[PDB]
Symmetry: C4
Subunit: 303 residues, 4 copies
């Protein structure tokens, strides 16, 4: 394995895996049979166990964080002499520890790899997500000690993001790894396109309705936007208010909006999701292989 | 040579504007020199021009939305000056769109049978303009239907932003895909559903005795409620022979679901490579429009 | 006496390759020629007349009073009664045509409910119209139910005339094929699951509004249309069992609805394009034969 | 020779009851002599025998349903038998249903012992046997609780009733369309529903915990309440305003919008598409698995004389 796994300066694994999202063929090169076998071998040797241990630790940490937050009480609040309070505060100090740990992990990531500042928002989505969670937790701490009530919003954002972050650990399993890859591809392509078009349609139709509406609760653009959105989730009322003239034009706008959005653009989202799944099978598999390779190399460098 | 600018007739000019009846409108655009020259001219000036046009139109739509939203007819404050200037600007923009629509109609003189198959965006812009002008006429005649004509114009204007996707590739292809369903499998797939809905609404309203759902409008709307995930199944109790009522409702629900299902199996039984060709064709049309319009 | 065009078009379903034999150059050419010459214009007129009949019947049914009822001498009421008379004449005509078809083509009891779908639909709508009349003259009230059933089947049979245009005829062919193939199995399995979970839930419920098998079944089915409640009763014991059962039913019913909405595409993303077009061609050929035999 | 009539080690029986590990236990049965033999024996006697079994099963399940739905509701079981024709019918229906439960329990115990399975693929293969054993176990524990003077006999009975009513799909085999429909159902539950449910449960628990943390207190201060409220979206009955006993409406609505966009918009339509590809990919596999299931039915009946 000369210049294959350990050169300490520049070797094939480090350049292939850590190459930025610019190389034309950064995915199919790992499919070389000896290299595939080598990665799988190192995995089975120790990386599988280290990843399982890390996953168990992360799940336990997030359970602790959920327990501490779910029982949250002008902070800070006095530490009452009761077992529940001691356990709550001990959970809080563990959560803060996790946040600071991820804050340093992201810093070390960005310093050791030092992306070119351009493809920093094109790859390494997991690391930026973890850094953002860490920042949310830190800002929650800062507001908590500053005697403000926005620390709840900060930490709930942190908690939701951290819970959704367990998708990171789906890698290391063939089936769930490919599933997570497909989810991410679909988010990037189909969700984005449909969301842009649908946002334009919804804003236009809500503006038309609110202009028609004379006064009342839905005279606000926000109220009318919420009402028109409630159609896409199978909850459209179609008669939320009668405070306006010319029932005809109101119903015409509502029916045109429903036909163009609910029956046409949703059917279009589903169809693109079908086409993509039928198209990017092997691409998803290669991306999963590369994700596992990056994890293996990192944990190998972590001793 | 006589392909880019002949000043009398060029291949790009004739291929761009050849009617829909021609068999291979977008296929021959794939010729190497045509593709390369179209791309060269686009990336030379049309991209910048199109970006500027899209920005101007978006700003205009924001202005018109603000003016219409804060409507106090007909009808010394900074807010009052902003509203009135917004109204004036919106009217002027509608007039300009009227002008451009008339100009295109006269120039291409479509055959009134593909006039609707082609120039879909042009027809949409013209109809927007006709709504705005009628809204002006009603407003200055001391009437109220100006609000209906304004809201329709505003809705079409905001939903017409999709014409500007051309210039962004993936957004252009997605927009081309939506166009296909509306101008091919929308009328046809909607006539069947409409006849089902009308027939079952007539059956139900006949079955009812009397109530707040005596009219055809209310019963038709109730039967439509199911299509939007709001099936009530009990809206009226004033009747006789409950079993016939409920079995008819179940029949309608199952049939409408199967109809939607057949819609999906039919249309999902798209193009991908043809859509890219369509988008390239529309981008080329934009390129020549910018070139001649300078 | 015996022509390949009339023999094959009316050939049984026992023949293997009807959908193919219409591809023969002379046959398809001649069928298109006859259509475009005369049968297109005859079919257009026939569709016009049928739609006018349906409008008349709809108007008559809508304004029904609240039998027989006395006629008050007003022009609108004379209009109503003559509408009802035209509606009965058309129903009788459809009944006569159905009986004539059954006494001419003698369907051999095997594909009788597989092919000739439109003819059977019209015949059953005739059986509804005539039984409605019989109830009406007998001083009975069920005539309203029979009449509404007939009206629903008529407006739905409107689709029979969708043929003569390729795209709409092919979509209608897809609807018929779906109804005869896939909704069958989907509804069998869905009914089994719905009844099982309905019985479980109603057994769990002690008493109340939703204590009957019928009300429980309705509340359960309400989930398939995205109008679930998940809390429609509380007069019982073991809320845990209630929630477990409702969650299991919701999960399984979505599995089933999905499995269908996918399996139909998976099986027939392919055959629809060509087989449905061939079937539409066959249906147009049969229409040509019927029109010609009607002179 | 020694294909189906060997009595020492027959290839047909060996392959039909073979280990799961066998690479192509489904493909080998397609051999023309094997398939011809299976079809012959089926048509000759197993068709009639299996249809009679289906009829008896349906009759048993109707009797049990009628007995349960008409149960006496008075508390503290058992209940004294009151002299009435209807009551005599309702108690004999009960005693027949109990007998059926015991019969299925013994059938399962027999399959378990006779087969001597691997204890590793035992769950992976033979889902039907374990499911029937489970309904029988529920029924027997329902009898025990009924005699033990408790109120959980009804819970055990309703679970058994639901499981048995859904178990009629075991008989879908023997009809090509519904057999292949059931096998596709089974594959799709094992793969696509499992993946989607893993991701969806993670997402739902995370966002529901976040919301219930945000919610100050009131009706929805319980984790279960917020979990149900969030699950109401995926069934197409979300509210978006079910609670207002909190602060910072901005964060609340942002969390709800994120949850909706991530689950309802994205993961459900991904389920659509993934199930589309799957079904478009695994047709012949389902056909072969159904053929093997009918083969196992035929062999079991033949050994049952
Ligand atoms: C902030 C917004 C982020 C939005 C991005 C979408 C979420 C998804 O990010 O990426 C999935 C996963 C993988 O990332 P990775 O960098 O490690 O992989 C990359 C990746 O494959 C890429 O092709 C190559 O660069 C190379 O293959 C490999 O290097 O990352 C996760 O673990 C998050 C998944 C869990 C979060 C999903 C929630 C939805 C995302 C939007 C909301 C985010 C906040 C919650
Ligand atoms: C432990 C619990 C795991 C639950 C997973 C779901 C199991 C399931 O669903 O498989 C239906 C089953 C028939 O599999 P089979 O054993 O016959 O198939 C196998 C299989 O194919 C194998 O590959 C071949 O070796 C060969 O074919 C054969 O070995 O049972 C039925 O006959 C349908 C009955 C359908 C009802 C069962 C599902 C009900 C869901 C919950 C119901 C809630 C009720 C309350
Ligand atoms: C009075 C009768 C009702 C008239 C319609 C009222 C105005 C509501 C909006 C009508 C929707 C028309 C269809 C539409 O606006 O979407 C199509 C475009 O996105 C397609 O993209 P593009 O314009 O071709 O570039
Ligand atoms: C005999 C039981 C009591 C009467 C209840 C009957 C419930 C049916 C209600 C009438 C509508 C049935 C129409 C139908 O069966 O679905 C649509 C047609 O298939 C479409 O076929 P086609 O296009 O007309 O050829
Ligand atoms: Na709903
Ligand atoms: Na719904």
């Amino acid at each position: 394995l000369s210049c294959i796994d350990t050169c300490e300066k520049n070797s094939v694994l480090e350049v292939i895996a850590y190459s930025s999202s610019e190389t034309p063929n950064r995915h199919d090169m790992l499919l070389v049979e000896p290299l595939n076998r080598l990665l799988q071998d190192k995995w089975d040797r120790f990386v599988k166990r280290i990843f399982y241990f890390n996953f168990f630790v992360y799940c336990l940490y997030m359970i602790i964080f959920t327990a501490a937050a779910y029982y949250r009480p002008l902070p800070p609040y006095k530490l009452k002499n009761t077992v529940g309070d001691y356990f709550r505060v001990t959970g809080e100090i563990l959560s803060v520890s996790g946040g600071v740990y991820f804050f340093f992990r992201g810093i070390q990531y960005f310093l050791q790899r030092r992306p070119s500042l351009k493809s920093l928002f094109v790859d390494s989505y997991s690391e930026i997500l973890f850094f953002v969670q860490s920042l949310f937790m830190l800002v929650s701490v800062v507001l908590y000690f500053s005697q403000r009530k926005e620390y709840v919003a900060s930490m709930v954002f942190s908690l939701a993001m951290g819970w959704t972050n367990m998708l990171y650990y789906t890698r290391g399993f063939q089936q769930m790894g490919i599933y997570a890859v497909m989810i991410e591809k679909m988010i990037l392509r189909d969700l984005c396109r449909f969301m842009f078009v649908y946002l334009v349609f919804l804003f236009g139709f809500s503006t038309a309705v609110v202009t028609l509406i004379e006064d009342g609760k839905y005279n606000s653009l926000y109220s009318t936007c919420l009402e028109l959105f409630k159609f896409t989730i199978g909850m459209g009322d179609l008669e939320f208010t009668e405070n306006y003239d010319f029932k005809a034009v109101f119903i015409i706008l509502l029916l045109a909006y429903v036909i163009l959005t609910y029956i046409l653009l949703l059917n279009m989202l589903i169809a693109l999701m079908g086409e993509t799944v039928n198209k990017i099978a092997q691409e998803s598999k290669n991306i999963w292989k590369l994700q596992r390779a990056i994890t293996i190399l990192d944990t190998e460098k972590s001793f």
